[PDB]
């Protein structure tokens, strides 16, 4: 009866250090719809994060895009932290610029 979120963390454009971009966390395939998503910079919550309006796929599972402007660098670490009823603890997915 419950479906756990798939999670992808990635940028809108190919990343280039020092150039402004968008950091995206796409959560999908989950049910029920209630979900909490944070984007993290060096382990801390990014304050200004927006998301898409709740919609769902042909199989009724939900999807949401969470996003924020960011300027990637060599050493700044980015991640998306997700909680949902199906998870015993928050799931953290680190941004990997090659994925």
């Amino acid at each position: 009866i419950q479906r756990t979120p798939k999670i992808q963390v990635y940028s809108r454009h190919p990343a280039e250090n020092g150039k402004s971009n968008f950091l995206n966390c796409y959560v999908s395939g989950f049910h029920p719809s209630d979900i909490e998503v944070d984007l993290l910079k060096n382990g801390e919550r990014i304050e200004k994060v927006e998301h898409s309006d709740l919609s769902f796929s042909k199989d009724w599972s939900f999807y949401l895009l969470y996003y924020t402007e960011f300027t990637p660098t060599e050493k700044d670490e980015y991640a998306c932290r997700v909680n949902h009823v199906t998870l015993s603890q928050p799931k953290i997915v680190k941004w990997d610029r090659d994925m």
Binding site: I1, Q2, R3, K6, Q8, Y10, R12, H13, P14, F22, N24, Y26, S28, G29, H31, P32, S33, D34, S52, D53, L54, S55, F56, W60, S61, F62, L65, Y67, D98, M99
Partner: protein, 276 residues
Amino acid sequence: GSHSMRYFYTAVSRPGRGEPRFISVGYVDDTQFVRFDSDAASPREEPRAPWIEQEGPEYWDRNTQICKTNTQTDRESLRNLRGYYNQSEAGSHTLQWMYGCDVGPDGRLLRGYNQFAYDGKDYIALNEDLSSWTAADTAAQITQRKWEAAREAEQLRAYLEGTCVEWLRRHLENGKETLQRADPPKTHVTHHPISDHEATLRCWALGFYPAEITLTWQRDGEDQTQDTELVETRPAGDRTFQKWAAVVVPSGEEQRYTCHVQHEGLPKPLTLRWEP
């Protein structure tokens, strides 16, 4: 090409925390164009694409009234549904609705849809005939009997064959610069050593619209279906989508592998190789 208009409705009960939240969105193909949210400061049908903003006050008010009435019907139906399954009033439950129409290049109806799910499971669906119902279980059979008695399929058929197709055609003309433009994928292959004896070849498709695309790896011209990691197509945030497919290859064997891309925006399918 072919096109679709689809509306999606989600109602979610939250006992002890007010009335069920009702959120609904409208799409033409992979472009969202409206939203309504009962938790908004001022709930109303809101534009979410530039081309819809030209519609007059009558459009906005009528769709707003529809959504307000639907908020109330969904809430009462959620109470009915809880009873149909002998459920307590204490838990949260979800009712989802999707309907819409698909049209061909020539603007004619291909098929219509009108279907519902309760707690993520198929509940009741209008059949492709737009005339009869398929109920998933004995609870949905109760709803079916009511809707049959009310001749509700007949109202739906009129909407899906008439209003839906007519408004889709209108949206396509108003949004012709975007809705009728396919943006082809930008494609490239990257190589990521894993160990002395294997590496990953990842075939990328970026910046494409609509979302439908096929990315496949072949080795000596044979599809690598079982050995390909294929991520779900994901939104970039600028209307376009992204996708990749990856394969683990023995060192030195990279040239035996080819990536194949099909997308509506491409004249002919593309074949790519890693280019060291």
